Amino acid sequence: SSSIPMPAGVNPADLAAELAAVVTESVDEDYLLYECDGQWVLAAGVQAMVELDSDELRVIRDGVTRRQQWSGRPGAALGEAVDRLLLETDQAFGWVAFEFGVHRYGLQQRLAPHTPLARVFSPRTRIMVSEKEIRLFDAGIRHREAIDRLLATGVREVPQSRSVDVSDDPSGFRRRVAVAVDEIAAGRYHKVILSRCVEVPFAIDFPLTYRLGRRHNTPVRSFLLQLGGIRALGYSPELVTAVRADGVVITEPLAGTRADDLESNSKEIVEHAISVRSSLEEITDIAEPGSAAVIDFMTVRLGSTIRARLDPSSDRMAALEALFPAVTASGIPKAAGVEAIFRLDECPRGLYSGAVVMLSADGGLDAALTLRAAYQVGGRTWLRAGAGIIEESEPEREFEETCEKLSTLTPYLVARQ
Numbered sequence: 518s519s520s521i522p523m524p525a526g527v528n529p530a531d532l533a534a535e536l537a538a539v540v541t542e543s544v545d546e547d548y549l550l551y552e553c554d555g556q557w558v559l560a561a562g563v564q565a566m567v568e569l570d571s572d573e574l575r576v577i578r579d580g581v582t583r584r585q586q587w588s589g590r591p592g593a594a595l596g597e598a599v600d601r602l603l604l605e606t607d608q609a610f611g612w613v614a615f616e617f618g619v620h621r622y623g624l625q626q627r628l629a630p631h632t633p634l635a636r637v638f639s640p641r642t643r644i645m646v647s648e649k650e651i652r653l654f655d656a657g658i659r660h661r662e663a664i665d666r667l668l669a670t671g672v673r674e675v676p677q678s679r680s681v682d683v684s685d686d687p688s689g690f691r692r693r694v695a696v697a698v699d700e701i702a703a704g705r706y707h708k709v710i711l712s713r714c715v716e717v718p719f720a721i722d723f724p725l726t727y728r729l730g731r732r733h734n735t736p737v738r739s740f741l742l743q744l745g746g747i748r749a750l751g752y753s754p755e756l757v758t759a760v761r762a763d764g765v766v767i768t769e770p771l772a773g774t775r776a777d778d779l780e781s782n783s784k785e786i787v788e789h790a791i792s793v794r795s796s797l798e799e800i801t802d803i804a805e806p807g808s809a810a811v812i813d814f815m816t817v818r819l820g821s822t823i824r825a826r827l828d829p830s831s832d833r834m835a836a837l838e839a840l841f842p843a844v845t846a847s848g849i850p851k852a853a854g855v856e857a858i859f860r861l862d863e864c865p866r867g868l869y870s871g872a873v874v875m876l877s878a879d880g881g882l883d884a885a886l887t888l889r890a891a892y893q894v895g896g897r898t899w900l901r902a903g904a905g906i907i908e909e910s911e912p913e914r915e916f917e918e919t920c921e922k923l924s925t926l927t928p929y930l931v932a933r934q
């Protein structure tokens with residue numbers, strides 16, 4: 518009974534997202550839904566929570582919070598607490614802030630107290646949905662009846678979406694781009710990713726919007742969550758880090774915006790090349806000597822793969838740190854790109870350009886780059902999108918680029934009922 522066959526015609530993304538809404542319609546618990554290689558893993562309810570902030574580490578279990586200071590690298594403090602969750606559970610889920618990646622580039626002192634770095638939990642129940650089957654882990658009657666009901670009655674029809682005006686520029690994106698172009702021309706750095714928030718003037722239904730957006734996007738990974746004060750969903754265009762139990766580490770930097778026409782394709786090839794080269798240099802830090810290599814370069818599958826063997830003196834959190842923040846969403850050289858984001862972008866970035874993570878007791882790690890996502894933190898609903906700024910960048914063209922990036926979400930926002 519812990520393996521229910523998936524009915525034909527039932528889309529796994531629709532069933533998994535409906536299950537998230539149904540299992541929590543009365544039991545107001547937190548959850549995280551992660552799509553990973555045809556498996557939609559719904560991690561439902563919080564058994565234990567690890568909260569890593571810039572100045573504090575908290576472990577919350579059975580209504581009891583244990584607080585402490587931490588020193589050293591954030592990956593080491595996070596890894597130690599997550600390994601402990603995983604002593605008695607198979608998997609842990611959560612998210613990692615853009616700010617988790619700053620310590621490596623000497624910018625930890627620039628974080629305000631209470632800056633979130635990571636939120637990772639062990640779930641009470643897991644439901645895995647694929648085209649093949651529905652697998653249940655530590656499920657009760659609530660979960661089983663939710664599955665039977667949805668298979669018997671069907672999923673809700675998705676309501677009509679509500680339009681949003683993304684043309685506004687209250688954070689001065691055009692102005693911020695002009696400053697970055699000047700610093701690039703002055704030789705400060707070669708590239709920086711700058712972004713802008715777009716406020717959504719209505720509360721959205723996250724599971725319904727997730728379902729609708731998922732019908733018109735085919736990402737590398739996707740997610741839907743409600744955790745602590747935060748709701749979020751996204752169609753991740755990049756696998757920033759994957760670590761297998763056997764020590765094989767990969768990173769798959771985004772090949773372009775398509776992953777006159779020659780000039781634009783040439784610009785994307787250059788950018789991608791630089792990202793792959795950066796990924797290779799950084800991965801070498803955690804790699805067994807001679808194991809780091811580009812195994813797939815711009816192949817149709819359009820993408821690239823950088824692989825390595827995890828050094829026995831290294832770990833999954835050091836691997837994540839080595840590659841964080843994603844080069845795709847920071848800049849070149851990385852240290853200068855990250856520092857320019859602290860001055861030229863709305864900070865803290867938090868989930869935006871951070872990662873949504875799935876960790877396994879066997880040492881596994883799957884980390885998706887958070888872009889093309891919607892968020893809600895008490896009363897505030899927003900979207901966020903950016904662009905790679907180079908010496909030749911034009912503020913108006915880059916603002917239009919963010920509009921194009923937003924167009925994968927904007928048509929699919931389902932308002933709360």
Ligand SMILES: O=C(O)/C(=C/c1ccccc1)Oc1cccc(C(=O)O)c1O
Nearest residue numbers: 539540542543544656657658659660662
């Ligand atoms: O999900 C169980 O395993 C469960 C056990 C239980 C309930 C009442 C009394 C004794 C046990 O409780 C529930 C069952 C069915 C639905 C729900 C629900 O919120 O939609 C629920 O909370």
Ligand SMILES: O=C(O)/C(=C/c1ccccc1)Oc1cccc(C(=O)O)c1O
Nearest residue numbers: 707708787788791794795849850851907
């Ligand atoms: O090597 C080039 O000439 C080059 C061009 C380029 C960079 C970003 C965007 C578009 C082009 O890249 C770089 C120049 C300087 C430093 C780095 C670096 O990784 O520390 C880098 O990758």
Ligand SMILES: O=C(O)/C(=C\c1ccccc1)Oc1cccc(C(=O)O)c1O
Nearest residue numbers: 771772773785788789888902903905922
């Ligand atoms: O816009 C590029 O730079 C890009 C990828 C790319 C990768 C290789 C070559 C060229 C472009 O994607 C992004 C970068 C930063 C922010 C976003 C964003 O949606 O908020 C984004 O889509």
Ligand SMILES: [Mg+2]
Nearest residue numbers: 904905906918
């Ligand atoms: Mg560009």
